[PDB]
Design a protein around this ligand. Structure first.
Ligand code: F97
Ligand code: F97
Lengths: 282, 282
């Protein structure tokens, strides 16, 4: 709730443009005073967007004290532009990384999964839902540590609804806000992410999005699998099988998944990502 | 399913640009052969959109034989542009109209409601849902007749989802397709539309969309009312009250609403809209 009505250039020095997503650009910046490096996610706004509607989402991201959640430092509104300031992760997303390094090993994937689960267990304990688990939203810093990127803010500045809000029935409004989601949907997304990291794509990546969603509603839908059976351990395959449980009633929770063989095995540490980063330099 | 891979300029002559919505422009055109006038809704496409995913929606709009549903004549795909060709309504939408004429009388509103209900009863009998009932989507032709504008096509070419499809759990995919909607949500939208026609705005029009939806989820939410009590009959107020029933379980169906005093009263005919159109000329 500390949204500063200041120019973030008073506190930070912009260094370079990391890129830009569906909305907004991301900058690498340095704090004037501490010299520390931060990430600034910028989002352009109209005189139509109201900022106070975001205050609940920014509360969510601010009151998140976990090692596997990227750190929030404040927000800045200035001249119709919104800036979210966060702890900087030098290596970027797993997707930035595997697009150069090629597929991850089972050990690297296992460690990432464990770390992601740790952050999810936390989030779900605070009754929050990430909603967008995927390789592009898992950040790696230069110490090989793993951070879930920001959530719940990007999808509310979705000027797109199947309908028009002022004319929406209450039941429609409810679904348009919640998305029918539940916490265990993060667990499914994690399973797909593990395949993504293993195969450089999520399943059905070469197929139109709408068709993919259609197919998931058919009576006899079959959850995706690892393509190459021989390449991966029985434990990995089972991890995939149980995270991609079709019914959300039978799908294991984050803390339950943390007890899984694949992520509770010894020897999982950031060293695994460190030689992944070394591979980046080769 | 008769989507022509031709240039619609072979069959139709473009005359003038009626305007443009969130996506695409609308043209007034003339059929070369019959001389009849049509409306052409154009929508620009990428090499990312797949046309066959639309074939189910175009089937919906094609197999609709009702007097209160705007008539579909065919589709055209050519050079990454999609054209939907429909019966032309000369006066445009009720919104195009009331923005010049000012508020509608209770009699004009009643006749519009009846006609809209007739189209809805039909749609719901074919187990279809309009999803976007509002003044901008109720068309008036030069004979004062009433036509529901196209539906289910506009909201699927919503490249916006709270999440990423390939990583979505099945339960999430289901809600992202259906929208949790049910047919009776059209009835709510009709009620809001009746206020819109009466007051030139839907309720809470000057309030941020997200806030409006939030409010509809609160324990003690109160459905909107006609602002000026004295201006409208007891029948009109009751029509508002029952269409804006909060619980979709207690909300009346289209055919039930057709038995309502306000829309079953004698003397409701297109003559009412005809002097509305005369007012347009003054
Ligand atoms: C997701 C983003 C809003 N965000 N949030 C917190 C956060 C913390 N650190 C980074 N760090 C990085 C590092 C790198 C590495 C430099 C050399 N190439 C990769 N690239 C990127 N960008 C690649 C494409 C992008 F989405 F613009 C980001 N971000 C990004 C961060
Ligand atoms: C909703 C649209 C896709 N559609 N679908 C079927 C259809 C049949 N007839 C019209 N006719 C008209 C008439 C007029 C009147 C001329 C003089 N001004 C109003 N304006 C408009 N446009 C105003 C703003 C728009 F959305 F571009 C339309 N459309 C539009 C139609």
């Amino acid at each position: 709730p500390d949204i500063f009505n200041r120019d973030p250039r008073d506190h930070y020095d912009l260094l370079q443009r990391l890129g830009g997503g569906t909305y907004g650009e991301v900058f690498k910046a340095r704090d004037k005073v501490s010299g520390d490096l931060v990430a600034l996610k910028m989002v352009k706004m109209e005189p139509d967007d109201d900022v106070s509607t975001l205050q609940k989402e920014i509360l969510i991201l601010k009151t998140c004290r976990h090692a596997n959640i990227v750190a929030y430092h404040g927000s800045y509104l200035w001249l119709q532009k919104l800036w979210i300031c966060m702890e900087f992760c030098g290596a970027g997303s797993l997707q930035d990384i595997y697009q150069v390094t090629g597929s991850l090993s089972e050990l690297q994937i296992s460690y990432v999964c464990r770390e992601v689960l740790q952050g999810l267990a936390y989030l779900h304990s605070q009754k929050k839902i990430h909603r967008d688990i995927k390789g592009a939203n898992i950040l790696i810093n230069d110490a090989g540590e793993v951070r879930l990127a920001d959530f719940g803010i990007s999808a509310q500045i979705r000027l797109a609804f199947i309908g028009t809000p002022y004319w929406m029935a209450p039941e429609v409004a409810a679904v348009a806000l919640k998305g029918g989601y539940n916490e265990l949907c993060d667990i499914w997304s994690l399973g797909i992410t593990a395949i993504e990291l293993a195969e450089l794509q999520p399943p059905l990546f070469d197929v139109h999005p709408l068709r993919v969603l259609f197919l998931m509603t058919k009576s006899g839908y079959q959850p995706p699998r690892l393509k190459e059976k021989g390449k991966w351990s029985a434990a990995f395959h089972n991890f995939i099988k149980v995270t991609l449980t079709k019914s959300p009633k039978k799908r294991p929770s984050a803390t339950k998944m943390l007890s899984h063989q694949l992520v509770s095995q010894p020897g999982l540490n950031r060293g695994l990502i460190l030689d992944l980063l070394d591979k980046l330099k080769n």
